[PDB]
Amino acid sequence: SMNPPPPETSNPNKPKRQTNQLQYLLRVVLKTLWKHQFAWPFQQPVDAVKLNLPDYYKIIKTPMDMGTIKKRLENNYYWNAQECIQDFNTMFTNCYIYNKPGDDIVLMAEALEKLFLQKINELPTEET
Ligand SMILES: Cc1noc(C)c1-c1ccc2nc(-c3cnn(CC(C)(C)O)c3)nc(N3CCOC[C@@H]3c3ccccc3)c2c1
User: Which fold has domain 19-123?
Assistant: First the structure.
């Protein structure tokens, strides 16, 4: 089998912006998560071929990972902080769909998501 093409990290027709919130997401939120003990499985797309995962890309049609989100923040791909926050949420949700509650990968995701939500509370309250 084959993996699909990864999600785009640049698009020459999509308008770009840097906001205070998008900056905080790169400089504070992603940085914290990236260095965490349980980050590594989320630092790049799920290689479903190499991990031999049954029907992964048949169940997960909107894949997402921190590797992608990191390059997207670095390339000023997003217009809004909400676009980025929904990428984080997609990634967690995906994990909780494909994997059994309480399995190791889910406990890792749950720890990252708790840390995510703590740092999302510190966001500048207005996007400028
Ligand atoms: C699936 C899935 N859904 O959301 C995410 C995120 C995943 C995901 C992503 C990457 C993964 N990478 C591995 C992995 C890559 N190398 N190794 C080390 C070694 C010695 C080859 O086993 C383990 N291993 C992974 N899983 C695959 C499924 O079962 C558990 C196994 C795992 C999880 C955590 C630690 C070790 C192994 C996993 C999983």
Answer: Histone Acetyltransferase; Chain A (1.20.920)
Resolution in Å equals 2.1
Q: How was it solved?
A: X-ray
Q: Using a 6 Å CB cutoff, which residues line ligand 1?
A: 41-42, 46, 51, 53, 95, 98-99, 104-105
Where along the chain do its domains lie?
19-123
Centre of ligand 1 to C-alpha 51, Å, is 7
Burial of 30 (0-12, 13-18, 19+ CB in 10 A): buried
3-state per-residue secondary structure call for the chain: CCCCCCCCCCCCCCCCCCCHHHHHHHHHHHHHHHCCCCCHHHCCCCCCCCCCCCCHHHHCCCCCCHHHHHHHHHCCCCCCHHHHHHHHHHHHHHHHHHCCCCCHHHHHHHHHHHHHHHHHHCCCCCCC
**Spacing, Cα 64 to ligand 1 middle (Å):** 15
